[PDB]
Symmetry: D2
Subunit: 250 residues, 4 copies
């Protein structure tokens, strides 16, 4: 039997790269999406052309709310329904935008989105993944710049720190069940679609190794290592994939 993976936010960019690589490695994949239905299905179409019935899609909002646990549980269930098993969870989906401390979503909607997508949904999915249970692991997409954060990104930063705490707490607690829990921390990978090109080059120029961003594939490579048999003793570890960026003083 082929193992199975859930990748959240898998329609585009890094999540897509991660789904594609797991599938190339032999996984069957659940492609979760929120708004990008068309892109999710076109990826599944591409993956299912390669190997029939090895990719499904799954829709969910991962904003925190009264129904988030049920949604998270259904994401995990959808993998069991499609493939009869769930070997790997990749927590990739993530809201990202500024939340200034001093001055139209309300602040509490921003808390729900930023803290839900980056921390609470990962926790709930982690609970469901472990409950519903080999080489089992979870990989959380973290952020190499958590200790030198973007200015005015308090909530996003809080959510990523919380995700580090989850990675550690879950590694500790799930080790007796054979479930490893690790992270991959990009620095500058694919820049935001909205960022202007000048500003993109400014960030690229900061990176010591090659003065460029990481491709989505290079991030996906670290995920693939972490879920592999070459990482069977690794839990609680967060691998930076940042080209030295986090080492560069102001």
């Amino acid at each position: 039997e082929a193992p199975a993976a859930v990748v959240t936010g898998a329609a585009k960019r890094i999540g897509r790269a991660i789904a594609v690589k797991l599938h190339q490695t032999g996984y069957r994949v659940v492609i979760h999406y929120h708004n990008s239905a068309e892109a999710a299905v076109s990826l599944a179409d591409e993956l299912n052309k390669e190997r029939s019935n090895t990719a499904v899609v799954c829709q969910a909002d991962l904003t925190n709310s009264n129904v988030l646990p049920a949604s998270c549980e259904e994401i995990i269930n959808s993998c069991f329904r499609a493939f009869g098993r769930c070997d790997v969870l990749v927590n990739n989906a993530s809201a990202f935008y500024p939340t200034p401390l001093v001055q139209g979503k309300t602040v509490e909607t921003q808390v729900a989105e930023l803290i839900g997508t980056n921390a609470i949904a990962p926790f709930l999915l982690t609970m469901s993944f472990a409950q519903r249970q080999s080489n089992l692991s979870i990989v959380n997409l973290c952020d190499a710049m958590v200790d030198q954060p973007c200015m005015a990104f308090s909530l996003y930063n809080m959510g990523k720190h919380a995700l580090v705490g989850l990675t550690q707490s879950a590694a500790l607690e799930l080790a007796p069940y054979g479930i490893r829990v690790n992270g991959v921390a990009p620095g500058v990978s694919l820049l935001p679609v909205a960022m202007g090109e000048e500003e993109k080059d400014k960030w690229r120029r900061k990176v010591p190794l090659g003065r460029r961003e990481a491709s989505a594939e290079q991030i996906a490579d670290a995920v693939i290592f972490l879920v592999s048999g070459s990482a069977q003793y690794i839990t609680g570890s967060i691998i930076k994939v940042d080209g030295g960026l986090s080492l560069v003083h102001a």
Copy 2:
């Protein structure tokens, strides 16, 4: 004129000790509390008997909800209402209980409480504190020295304390241009839980390299007083461990 401080969860234990020491240092204090009304009033009474009109209490639930921001705004506004200023914010109030990943409150209530008290309310109180300014302004967040060696089955609590580390850093960076410093104090083992039995308390005490005992509430409060003082005017974004070496001890 005397400066003023808000201390969250200040009715008892470490919060009380911080309020008392701020008061002994010359601050007027807002003693925030949630359920411990009697202890909070008893504190304010003692402080006002020492110096009249220098302590008031302020009730608020710091669970996350759509009204938590107005509740946090009101906490800061109660300092200005009582004392005409707000110089210091200490984020001490904290929910703390296990949330096992594999198996009472709904999980969304646990999230609301553990993440709300430990991170969201500090963030909203920071926003409000900063917004109301309009000097030695600072914020001290009560953190946790065992954050990278966490208590088994305390996921949400640990997430909340990690998030608070991130707020401390993010706010230190962002509020520095306003002259608001933001720091943290990280206890290891201090006052053990009221409900813990003596035998269990001793097991923890025996782990502590420095004196095989927990930190007094006062010793925690001392590090808070340092960070608010003029002796710490260049310190921002620092979290001081107050743990007798506990976090250095391997399994």
Copy 3:
């Protein structure tokens, strides 16, 4: 043209397992050793039987002294002399013994040995590696327990801390030359030969992931990853390979 790697302290245990996996991956190897002459030459024989002329030994004391730079330069030179190139350096050789602060070598010898092997030698080998110069990289064998250190191991812990600093500084400074510098940090792996059984078992019981020590091969797997094409954007990272041990409170 097959790449070439120097592995220090490669006669035995983790260093051995690293040299073996590097060789299996296609590398030619310099098997550095200090006192383990017989195991070193025996390992070279093993590997050379598999592919002729793909392993040589190189003897050197890595204690700090006025001649250590020359010795380090020679180790690198020995890789060029055997194979015409040097693509990978693995800093594995390491002295390890207690140096109590309060009361049969002298303290300056203990300093030279512990700080030399764990920090100075890696620094000088890094200099000579870079000076002599693609997928070039350096992997430093660190320690996951560096912030929860063994009692009365000050000098050793100082050495491994210094080694983290080197990893970071070297990643930063060598990134313009295309040389990546990373680390692998074991917790409990192969236990001391001189340690007694009951004590070995006490340490095993502490490891959340499986209640056992890492094999030398599990440690080598992480080295192999960091030198590979799948780690091309990775520099300045230290991967814990510790089964969750560093997450466990006292």
Copy 4:
């Protein structure tokens, strides 16, 4: 009776400020120096003028060598000879200069100087301090240790080893009641020769006030750690950096 402190590299700048504040707090002080004899002596004369018989000087090279353990024992012993006790050790003296990985001092002299001053000497002074016993040690660290100066490998290795010492010694000496902590400046007093335009570059990076820490601000954090108000604090390194270490590239 008055407690006593050894401050290494105390003739100038941050070490001087530390020695003065310790003295203002009631400590008798050993002012260690290497080359700056004239400044160490004028400091001693200043402090003895304030209160008689409360400052002495001690010359020593803290470069690593065969004789460094004896030199470090002598510094401690000199505190006992002058004052009958040694309550506080402040490891401040520090060599600092670039050591590029790719290219008069040989590289082994740089190793001896950079690693000796920043790490080995603190280690030897710590053993001597402890062997002779509110006792504490404060080590001067560096807030920028994880975002290091380009081409300062050996220096950075030295300061990292110092963090390790701080932690290892905190753990091991806790049973004797000796606390061991650090103060980590980011940008404090800039090099004497540095052009203002270069100094200002650094000052502008500092979120809190867009200026460097005074030596006195660094000293304040030392005074807190040695005090009765830090009685439970061991193995802690306090950044005194105006938020510099939180600033991304």
